Amino acid sequence: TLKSFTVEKGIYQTSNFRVQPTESIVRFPNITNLCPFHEVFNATTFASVYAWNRKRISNCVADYSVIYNFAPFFAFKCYGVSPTKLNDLCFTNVYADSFVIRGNEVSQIAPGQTGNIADYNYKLPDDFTGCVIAWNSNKLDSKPSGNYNYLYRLFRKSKLKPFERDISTEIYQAGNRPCNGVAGPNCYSPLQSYGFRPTYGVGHQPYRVVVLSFELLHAPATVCGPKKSTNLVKNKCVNFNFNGLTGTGVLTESNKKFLPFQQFGRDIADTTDAVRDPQTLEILDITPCSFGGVSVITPGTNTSNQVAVLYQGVNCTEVPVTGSNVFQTRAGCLIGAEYVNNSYECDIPIGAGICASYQTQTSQSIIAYT
Amino acid sequence: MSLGAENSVAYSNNSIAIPTNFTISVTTEILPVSMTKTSVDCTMYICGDSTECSNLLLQYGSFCTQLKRALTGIAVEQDKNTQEVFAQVKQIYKTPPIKYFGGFNFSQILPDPSKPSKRSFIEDLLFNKVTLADAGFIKQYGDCLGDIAARDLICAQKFNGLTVLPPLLTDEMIAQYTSALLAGTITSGWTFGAGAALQIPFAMQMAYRFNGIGVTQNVLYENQKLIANQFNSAIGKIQDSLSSTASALGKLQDVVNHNAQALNTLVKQLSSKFGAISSVLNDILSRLDKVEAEVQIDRLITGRLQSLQTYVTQQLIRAAEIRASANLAATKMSECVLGQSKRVDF
Amino acid sequence: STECSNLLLQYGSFCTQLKRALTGIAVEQDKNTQEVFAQVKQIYKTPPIK
Amino acid sequence: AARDLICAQKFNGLTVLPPLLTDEMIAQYTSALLAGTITSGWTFGAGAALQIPFAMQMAYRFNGIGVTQNVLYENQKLIANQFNSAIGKIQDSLSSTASALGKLQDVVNHNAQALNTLVKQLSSKFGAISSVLNDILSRLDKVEAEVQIDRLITGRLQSLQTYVTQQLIRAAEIRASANLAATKMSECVLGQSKRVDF
Amino acid sequence: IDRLITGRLQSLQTYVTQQLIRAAEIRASANLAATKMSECVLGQSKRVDF
Amino acid sequence: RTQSYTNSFTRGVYYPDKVFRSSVLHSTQDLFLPFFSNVTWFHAIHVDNPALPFNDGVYFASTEKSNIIRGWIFGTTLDSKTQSLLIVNNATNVVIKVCEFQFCNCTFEYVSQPFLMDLFKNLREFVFKNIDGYFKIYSKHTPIDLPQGFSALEPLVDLPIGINITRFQTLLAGAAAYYVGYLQPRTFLLKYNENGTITDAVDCALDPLSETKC
Numbered sequence A: 001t002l003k004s005f006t007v008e009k010g011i012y013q014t015s016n017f018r019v020q021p022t023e024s025i026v027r028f029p030n031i032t033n034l035c036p037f038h039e040v041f042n043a044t045t046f047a048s049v050y051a052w053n054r055k056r057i058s059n060c061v062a063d064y065s066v067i068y069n070f071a072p073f074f075a076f077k078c079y080g081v082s083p084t085k086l087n088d089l090c091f092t093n094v095y096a097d098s099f100v101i102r103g104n105e106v107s108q109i110a111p112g113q114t115g116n117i118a119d120y121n122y123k124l125p126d127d128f129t130g131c132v133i134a135w136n137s138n139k140l141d142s143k144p145s146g147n148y149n150y151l152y153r154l155f156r157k158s159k160l161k162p163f164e165r166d167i168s169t170e171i172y173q174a175g176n177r178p179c180n181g182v183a184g185p186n187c188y189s190p191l192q193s194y195g196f197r198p199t200y201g202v203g204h205q206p207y208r209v210v211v212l213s214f215e216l217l218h219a220p221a222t223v224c225g226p227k228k229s230t231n232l233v234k235n236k237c238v239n240f241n242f243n244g245l246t247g248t249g250v251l252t253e254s255n256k257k258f259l260p261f262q263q264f265g266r267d268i269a270d271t272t273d274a275v276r277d278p279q280t281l282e283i284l285d286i287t288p289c290s291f292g293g294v295s296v297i298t299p300g301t302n303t304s305n306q307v308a309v310l311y312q313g314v315n316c317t318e319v320p321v322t323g324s325n326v327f328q329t330r331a332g333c334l335i336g337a338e339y340v341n342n343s344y345e346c347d348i349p350i351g352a353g354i355c356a357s358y359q360t361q362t363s364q365s366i367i368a369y370t
Numbered sequence B: 001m002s003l004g005a006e007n008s009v010a011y012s013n014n015s016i017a018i019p020t021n022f023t024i025s026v027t028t029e030i031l032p033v034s035m036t037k038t039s040v041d042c043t044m045y046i047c048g049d050s051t052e053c054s055n056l057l058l059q060y061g062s063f064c065t066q067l068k069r070a071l072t073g074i075a076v077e078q079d080k081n082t083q084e085v086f087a088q089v090k091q092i093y094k095t096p097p098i099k100y101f102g103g104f105n106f107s108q109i110l111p112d113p114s115k116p117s118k119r120s121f122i123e124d125l126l127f128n129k130v131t132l133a134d135a136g137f138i139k140q141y142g143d144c145l146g147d148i149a150a151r152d153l154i155c156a157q158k159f160n161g162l163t164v165l166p167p168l169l170t171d172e173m174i175a176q177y178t179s180a181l182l183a184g185t186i187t188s189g190w191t192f193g194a195g196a197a198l199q200i201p202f203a204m205q206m207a208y209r210f211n212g213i214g215v216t217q218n219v220l221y222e223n224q225k226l227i228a229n230q231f232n233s234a235i236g237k238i239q240d241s242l243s244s245t246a247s248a249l250g251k252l253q254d255v256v257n258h259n260a261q262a263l264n265t266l267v268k269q270l271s272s273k274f275g276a277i278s279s280v281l282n283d284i285l286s287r288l289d290k291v292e293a294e295v296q297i298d299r300l301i302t303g304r305l306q307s308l309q310t311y312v313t314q315q316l317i318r319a320a321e322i323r324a325s326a327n328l329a330a331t332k333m334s335e336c337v338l339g340q341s342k343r344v345d346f
Numbered sequence C: 001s002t003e004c005s006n007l008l009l010q011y012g013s014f015c016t017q018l019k020r021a022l023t024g025i026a027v028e029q030d031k032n033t034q035e036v037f038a039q040v041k042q043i044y045k046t047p048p049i050k
Numbered sequence D: 001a002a003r004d005l006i007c008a009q010k011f012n013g014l015t016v017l018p019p020l021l022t023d024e025m026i027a028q029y030t031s032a033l034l035a036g037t038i039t040s041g042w043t044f045g046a047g048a049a050l051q052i053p054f055a056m057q058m059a060y061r062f063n064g065i066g067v068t069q070n071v072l073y074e075n076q077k078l079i080a081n082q083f084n085s086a087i088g089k090i091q092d093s094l095s096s097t098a099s100a101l102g103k104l105q106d107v108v109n110h111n112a113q114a115l116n117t118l119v120k121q122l123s124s125k126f127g128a129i130s131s132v133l134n135d136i137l138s139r140l141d142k143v144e145a146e147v148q149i150d151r152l153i154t155g156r157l158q159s160l161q162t163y164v165t166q167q168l169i170r171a172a173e174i175r176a177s178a179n180l181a182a183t184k185m186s187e188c189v190l191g192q193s194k195r196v197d198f
Numbered sequence E: 001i002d003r004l005i006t007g008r009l010q011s012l013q014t015y016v017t018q019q020l021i022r023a024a025e026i027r028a029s030a031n032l033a034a035t036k037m038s039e040c041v042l043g044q045s046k047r048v049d050f
Numbered sequence F: 001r002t003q004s005y006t007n008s009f010t011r012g013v014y015y016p017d018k019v020f021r022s023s024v025l026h027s028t029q030d031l032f033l034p035f036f037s038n039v040t041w042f043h044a045i046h047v048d049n050p051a052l053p054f055n056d057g058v059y060f061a062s063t064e065k066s067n068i069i070r071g072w073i074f075g076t077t078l079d080s081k082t083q084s085l086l087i088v089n090n091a092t093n094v095v096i097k098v099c100e101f102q103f104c105n106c107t108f109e110y111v112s113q114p115f116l117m118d119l120f121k122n123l124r125e126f127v128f129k130n131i132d133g134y135f136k137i138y139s140k141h142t143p144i145d146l147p148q149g150f151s152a153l154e155p156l157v158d159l160p161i162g163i164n165i166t167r168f169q170t171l172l173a174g175a176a177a178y179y180v181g182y183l184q185p186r187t188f189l190l191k192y193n194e195n196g197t198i199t200d201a202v203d204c205a206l207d208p209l210s211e212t213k214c
Ligand SMILES: *[C@@H]1O[C@H](CO)[C@@H](O[C@@H]2O[C@H](CO)[C@@H](O)[C@H](O)[C@H]2NC(C)=O)[C@H](O)[C@H]1NC(C)=O
Pocket: B021, B022, B023, B226, B229, B230, B233
């Protein structure tokens, strides 16, 4: 610590001590159903972009490693979560939005991005936490004579809500002349038709887009991964996994009167204080296990090599471990130095009226005194 | 606002004003000496039981060696500040069992054997009007395991690596030093600060002390009872003023309040995101992959390190102010308790 | 700017510390002037004869 | 037409608060102290004001420094003329020389220069594309402008913290000087001092 | 280069702030030394324990 | 209609989240009912303006002792989607539907005990919010003009309706009285006691004393 080979007489603060965890426990809900992605990715026809299908998937087990075998997509874009860690933590419900778009419009399905399809057809929120999948559909959604199945909206009076669907077709009034259902010179139809040909370039090609949206907890978890649960253990500093909430500490039965809609508990520093167990409805409060400071009390290196250790603030009937002498102090406890009933001047100040010194005993020892 | 009452001195070049009577008064001056000794663990405050965040913290400089060195230099300086102020006497003096000091009472400032803490009555009043928190290691690192439904900020400060060290001199030894100084200055006067103690009757060293202000010593010996009654009445009025008003000790309460709210702000700074996606390292490690969580952990490390540097700089400035006040208190103890001062309004 | 304001509240609570420091400095300067100059109980007046 | 520095530092939230005591109140305090010192001596600093002729007060002052009081009453006119010439000489020295008051002018220059540096730090880019927030908000989308505004926020917050730390250090130095001035007012205006070169 | 510049600027600012605080402490000690030289070498001192 | 005006006092406090907090003072900015605003009475007698503006969240209160107040008809005009809750109080049928047109079996079904369930007059307080396509319901009955005091509201139901709502009406299927107040974005300072219940709050934009307290 001192980066030196000779240590002068006194008390120094070296590295701290921690109580290491013994085992690990994994906790997950009581649901064994399988999530049905087989009616989402392959289908005869997809919904239009102005009328996009929303599928709620909940109360099942989602294996995200079989998504790559269901559609030929080059990448797997995500915001707020990694693609590789989708099987580790778990959520409340997952939402699927499947629709077809053009080649220009792939980039505008993004948070905080405007354009033509993002502000009139489908708007994503700026705090979107989910994944976007896009893939080519040349041999599935194209015809040589022109595929006119899908439609689009391009004129609107105002902007768009995040996650809003517009179905009604009304003739736009772009001028002072009233329309009244007449598509005249100043009135136009709000929906024209997509035209797809196989002779177009790659920037106008069909693209099927599936958007998976997540919700970060705030509710009892219903969709979770294939991680196997483990039986509970108490009064031991262990590593816990409460519905994807990881951490290390000791768990105890508590007496905090949780309301029935409450699951977590926050401290001033916004850390998790108490958790409701998902399998059995009971409360456990999390405490970090024992730690503290280590102080080294020594005389000079040329004098002797005897060392006393002071554990700062620790009532050391709980220390898992160093001589045969243990002395309690208002600053902690002292190991390696014996207590005497005499009184001298203060040589090495420990604290709370206690000092230590290297003195003869008959034969040489480190003693502590008032 | 009003500057004061309007007055005009009737000055003339053949007129003088001379007093015929006096008044003995006892005033009270409050002085801070030491502040709270604190210790900060960087590794557990910044990251906390995290291998990846610790390895990213090692990629920075030797910032935390500097912070720990500065906090240790403050913590030694507080004990030095107490040692210079209170330990100005070589030998612990004791008062005789007979307490007739020429008619002066001296019962409310000399210690009593009934109390186990060996503090006098006015010291008990001074220790009662300051609601002090974080006196040292009160919890002893096991009181927070006994979870209470009303959680206090002390366990939250403890569980983030922000510890408070106890002072070297306990309050029993401070009371013993104060009792030694009082027993020196009652039975001997200013002689115990130069060499050994020189015994002298109290009504004679009081007549010595009237000679230092230009008053002849017959004034005491013809008015001893009136001066003793005035001193006893002033002592009783000081006792009543300390019993009634609790806002007189405002200088010592701010030393507790500043060092409580600084640690409270340092604890509350852990809940900020600092531009990242979350304020919890476990959720960052669980959600993201390695490369993006490196960026998020870097943002949290930079924010928490800047907060720790701000706290350390504020503690350094406050420790400088406390050291200046402690030097003033040591000079006041050396020049006024151990002698008699001719400096005006000192 | 409301975007900079949102990022500033998302950043932290340094600004309350800065405001407290500057307010303490200002109260300290008022105390300095009051301590140096106001050491007399009554506003005396010189006689007209000089 | 030509904007001064006061309006430039006023428009960015850097305001200046008035002192609590106006200059008339400070002048009244010093006038009261002078009147008490002339008509009373040191007796107005202990209890109430005791009137005394000024020749007798200066005789007491000579008895303070170890000179017997018969020196004053035989040399009163010479001492009065020497004091009048000394006051006139210090008046002419204050009128002519302009560099004697370099301590208060340094305080004024330091505060004005610190505020000018804090204002001039708003023109820096700190690695962003522009130093104006409206140009970034009108030239980019949300995602990149969040990064640019974050860079500008970090730079401006670091500059503000540097200014606050410098103000705290200067406040500590000024408080030490004010404590010394209060001690000099208590020990020398309100009574005679036996400390050498104080 | 931007990351290295930010780190080195933070280190330099820490060094300058610590040097300023140490300069204030040394200035206080030098004022005490000048007072002791004026009051004890150039004349006798009546102050106790000075 | 008989629109009568009164005062709201300090009412409409609800839990901003679903986490536990004890002996803390927490500041949240959300869609709240401001302190000392004017809620409007209603006296609908059947022997009725068909437009109540939503204005980004609504606070409902009822002092009736039976099931006269049935449900709510959230939507806009009659041009697209526009149908909503059909709450009835026997044991079940909390059905919410987005059926098209047909004013004056489609998307969702909710089962078990309905929203209004109470037996010394009771004041049922409801908060209806719709943020970013998420539709949220708060409900609490209090045994008791509006009384003075604090009583919090608990969350019940979140929904992915995803529609734009600007017009509503209660279902009265004769005398009735229901309080309607409007929510605005405001910041509070909620006080949590030792048991995790809100007992006092301060609106940070009412008067400068509350601004100082915040
Ligand atoms: C000087 O002042 C003291 C008060 O500080 C006077 O003492 C009081 O005298 C009156 C006269 O009857 C008594 O009633 C009081 O009880 C005395 N106060 C005490 C003893 O504390 C004293 O008389 C004055 N001397 C004079 C006027 O020569």
